Structure 1
Amino acid sequence: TSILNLRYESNHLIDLSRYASKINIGSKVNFDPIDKNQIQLFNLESSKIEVILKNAIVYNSMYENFSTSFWIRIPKYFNSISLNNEYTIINCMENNSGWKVSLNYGEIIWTLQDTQEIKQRVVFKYSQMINISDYINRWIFVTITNNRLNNSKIYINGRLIDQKPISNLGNIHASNNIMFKLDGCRDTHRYIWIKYFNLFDKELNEKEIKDLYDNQSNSGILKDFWGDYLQYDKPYYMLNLYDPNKYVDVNNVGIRGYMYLKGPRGSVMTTNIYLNSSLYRGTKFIIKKYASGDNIVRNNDRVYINVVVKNKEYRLATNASQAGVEKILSALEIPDVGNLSQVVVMKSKNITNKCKMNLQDNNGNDIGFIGFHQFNNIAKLVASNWYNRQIERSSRTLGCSWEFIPVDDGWGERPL
């Protein structure tokens, strides 16, 4: 379908469309060594990708409909020079006619313009004065569709944000090339992450976009909070969606003690820039391979869970033969787990679900999804098979619904 399909293959970024347009990468473009399709652009002239399109598919019309798709991870704004500093990141403008994706404090912007000095903007706005955002420094799926008889539409994660009229225009003559580059950005330490860039020769409908959202989401590989692949031997701070103003703690190590949800998790704050909930809080987990035989955590991968207390690595375990419905979890010293239950099946989907860790015994029986429960007003981490049971034919948020947060330059909080 695609007239442009920017994809990384072998050791080069290419167009997977028949038009096989030529791509001119700069000296200072970074690729994620784990997913090279994840592209990192800096505020440096050399950090730029240029697509030199074939002259056929070049847009020069007043009635041809088109759409553009991509995923983007936009790090949090840290500085005040970036408030009201709109900066272009993708550009197909030739003599102020064509289109461009631009960014600015709390906004992703789309602009079309014709040969006769008339434009139109659609804008998705997001806040940074917010406890837990869906949009700050997290891979979001942006899709922009255009119909010349009516409107331009801005969809985020499959869902319509805004629509603005473009029937007044206007023959548009776009550039012969697309420039991926931050242009006009006054924040010297600034970047974006970009991946899966597509162009389409029509206005996509609202089902085609949901479908593209669902396939490019890599159902089958667990993700962290930010959207990247979940990894082994990598510390993650833990976020419980059911109760997000609480962080994980251990009162004491050993089958004596318990892991629990402690509150209130605090805030991070830059004056006039952001006020958020703190994400780097409490005991870190590390996902350990059960089978040492690639550090990407995939659906149905049997693992252990390590736990860091006072700088030392422990083990998440429980006795499921204990009396009651929920089996309370403890952080065990590792050479002393014995035959307690500790092996965890990691879950991406069934179908997707935020409920990620299913606790088992050593003979293949479900102990339950790791979550929490209130005992004597102490929200202790437990496993329970109620979780596994509400997950039949529902997809709502539960106390087993978790998010893994590693330290990241886009968030910029002090780790502790």
Structure 2
Amino acid sequence: YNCILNIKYEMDRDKLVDSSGYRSRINIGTGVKFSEIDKNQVQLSNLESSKIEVILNNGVIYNSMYENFSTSFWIRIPKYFRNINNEYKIISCMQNNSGWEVSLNFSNMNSKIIWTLQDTEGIKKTVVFQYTQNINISDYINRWIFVTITNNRLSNSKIYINGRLINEESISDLGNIHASNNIMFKLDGCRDPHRYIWIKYFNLFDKELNKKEIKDLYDNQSNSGILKDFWGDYLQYDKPYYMLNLYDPNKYLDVNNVGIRGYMYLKGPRGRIVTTNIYLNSTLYMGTKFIIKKYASGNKDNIVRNNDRVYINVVVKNKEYRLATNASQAGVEKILSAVEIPDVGNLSQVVVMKSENDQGIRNKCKMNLQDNNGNDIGFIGFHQFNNIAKLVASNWYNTFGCSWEFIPVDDGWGESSL
């Protein structure tokens, strides 16, 4: 990829380093916060100390009329709750009004990601990606987004999102671009004291990446063996999740009654949360919460991986129960129950966790229930029993809605968890 900068967490020295081979120095401010689950994820808040400065290896400093180059990174931007029309920088490689930079903005309910080039005569070119907050379920709001920006000095700058080309702008009218010796990762000019971003995997490439390269990069950095929650973070054990069923996003999961004679079902309406002319979204913190419990994961840590065997705890009136069924019950759709954990006995309760990767909304999960001999009982979804859509496990080779997302409470979403 002609990679000339690759910011990566290194376990041995417990530190962010440049692993490109060029050994650019990475200085971290005391205001930077790290995810304890994934040390590549760093949080930059609106504080002077919340910054990362890269001192570029002399050989990778950009000063050229013709050198093609690209950059990639992942970013997670909290919902905007207030207007600003206050464009603020987040990644800066500028000196004397020339170079490149990434900035963010929020206007007319659109969150914007902005790429700017500026030549040594002060002339600017920009390419923008934007997405609306006026939408029931967003692939983008407060979710990890993969950004790739490529620059061909003889033609266009292009912005790719999650491996897909979104926008292009001609940049052939720019002359010499003399960028900074340093790259500054920092909220610069942001007037909201409480704004922040999450970022990871920042890369620079000494070429214009092509379509295939970018899709491969996206796929390789997706960590596709690990399940994701709604926000795109690693799915985890022992963490309460609200459940989104993608079949009918306007409904939510509820428990009619606990016990092996009870059932769960699809209840509506989910409803919406609104701040007029700022956002209008489906309410996410609705319905029964699931907690994923370790059973047979080979691993030590709390991350849920493809084909992990787990138990699912179901929270009802602030008490935990176990998702289970008697597969011997009549019919191909096995109605699921929330049963008292000490009393689950010989009921089927082992769930195989699966990723679902297609070209629709990201971070989809499936759950395949098995009996205690490993035999498939079926994927967890719904079946219409006259008037009621009940939660069931059903073998597809023997009913609907077996695609799920797990939603934990997150400060960037802004529904109150009170």
Taking structure 1 as the reference length, what is the TM-score of the superposition?
A: 0.95
AA aligned opposite 2:217: L
The aligned residue for residue 196 of structure 1 is 201
Contact 1:220 1:349 in 2 (8 A): no
Equivalent positions of 1:52-91 (< 5 A) are: 52-80=55-83, 82=84, 84-91=85-92
The corresponding residue for 1:283 is: 288
* Cα shift at 1:354: 2.9
Q: Deviations over 1:242-265 (max 9, x none)?
A: 111111001111121111111110
C-alpha contact 2:228 2:364 (8 A) present in aligned 1:
no
**Equivalent residue of 2:288, what SS?**
coil
State whether residues 8 and 36 of structure 1, in contact with CA within 8 Å, keep that contact through their aligned partners in structure 2. Answer: yes
- 2:28 alignment counterpart: 25
Q: Which residue of 1 aligns with 2:265?
A: 260
The equivalent residue for 2:323 is 316
Q: Aligned AA for 2:173?
A: N
Aligned to 2:367: 357
**Aligned ranges for residues 148-187 of structure 1 at < 5 Å?**
148-187=153-192
Give CA deviations for 1:166-189 in whole Å, capped at 9, x if unaligned.
011111101111000000001110
Deviations 1:324-377 (A, max 9, x none): 221111111111112111110111269898342110001110011111111112
Query: Cα deviations across residues 96-132 of structure 1 (Å, max 9, x unaligned)?
Result: 1111010011100000010112111110011111111
| Unmatched tracts of structure 1, length 5 or more | 391-397
| Matching of residue 112 in structure 1 with residue 114 in structure 2 | no
Distance 2:9 2:256 in 1: 47
Deviates more, 1:252-261 or 1:39-48: 252-261
Q: Distance in 1 between matches of 2:365 and 2:183?
A: 40
Q: How many residues align?
A: 406
Query: What residue in structure 2 maps to residue 395 of structure 1?
Result: none
Residue 393 of structure 1 corresponds to: none
- Compared CA separation, residues 258 and 215, structure 1 to 2 (3 A): same
**Residues 299 and 349, structure 1, Cα contact 8 Å, conserved in 2:** no
Question: Equivalent residue for 2:412?
Answer: 410
How far did 1:385 drift? 1.4
The 1-side partners of 2:121 and 2:198 are apart by 34
Greater alpha carbon shift after TM alignment, 136-145 vs 398-407: 398-407
Match of 1:123 in 2: 128
Percent of aligned pairs sharing the same letter: 84
Map of 2:100 onto structure 1: 99
Q: Superposition pairs for residues 229-244 of structure 1, below 5 Å?
A: 229-244=234-249
Amino acid at match of 1:407: V
Mark the CA change 1:389 to 1:68 in structure 2 (over 3 Å): closer, same or farther.
farther
- Is 1:355–1:369's contact at 8 Å kept on the other side of the alignment? no
Q: Give distance in 2, aligned partners of 1:141 and 1:17.
A: 19
242-251 or 268-277: bigger deviation: 268-277
Considering only aligned residues, what root-mean-square deviation do their CA atoms show, in Å?
A: 1.7
Shift of 1:48: 0.3
Amino acid at match of 1:379: A
Task: Return the letter of the residue paired with 1:233.
Answer: D
Cα distance change of structure 1 residues 78 and 350 upon mapping to structure 2, 3 Å threshold: closer
Tell me the amino acid that sits aligned with residue 388 of structure 2: I
- For residue 395 of structure 2, what is the aligned residue in structure 1? 385
Distance in 1 (alpha carbons) for counterparts of 2:357 and 2:239: 25
User: 2:151 is matched with which residue?
Assistant: 146
CA distance in 2 between partners of 1:136 and 1:96 (Å): 32
Runs of 5+ consecutive residues of structure 2 not aligned to the other structure: none
Q: Name the aligned partner's letter for residue 401 of structure 1.
A: S
**How far apart in 2 are the matches of 1:291 and 1:162?**
45
- Which consecutive aligned stretches of 4+ in structure 1 deviate over 4 angstroms post-superposition? 349-353
Distance 1:345 1:239 in 2: 18
Decide whether the 8 Å contact of 1:219 with 1:349 is kept in 2: no
Indicate whether 1:299 and 2:303 are aligned: no
| 1:325 lines up with 2:326 in the alignment | no
After TM superposition, give the deviation of residue 56 of structure 1 in Å: 1.8
Say if 1:154 and 1:160, in contact at 8 Å, map to a contact too: yes
Distance 1:208 1:185 in 2: 34
Q: 2:89 aligns to what SS in structure 1?
A: strand
Cα deviation, 1:282-339, whole Å, max 9, x if unaligned, reads 1100001114861111111111100011111111111111122211111111111121
What is the rounded CA distance, in whole Å, between the counterparts of 1:375 and 1:349 in structure 2?
A: 27
- Cα offsets for 1:209-235 (capped at 9, x unmatched): 111111111111111000111111110
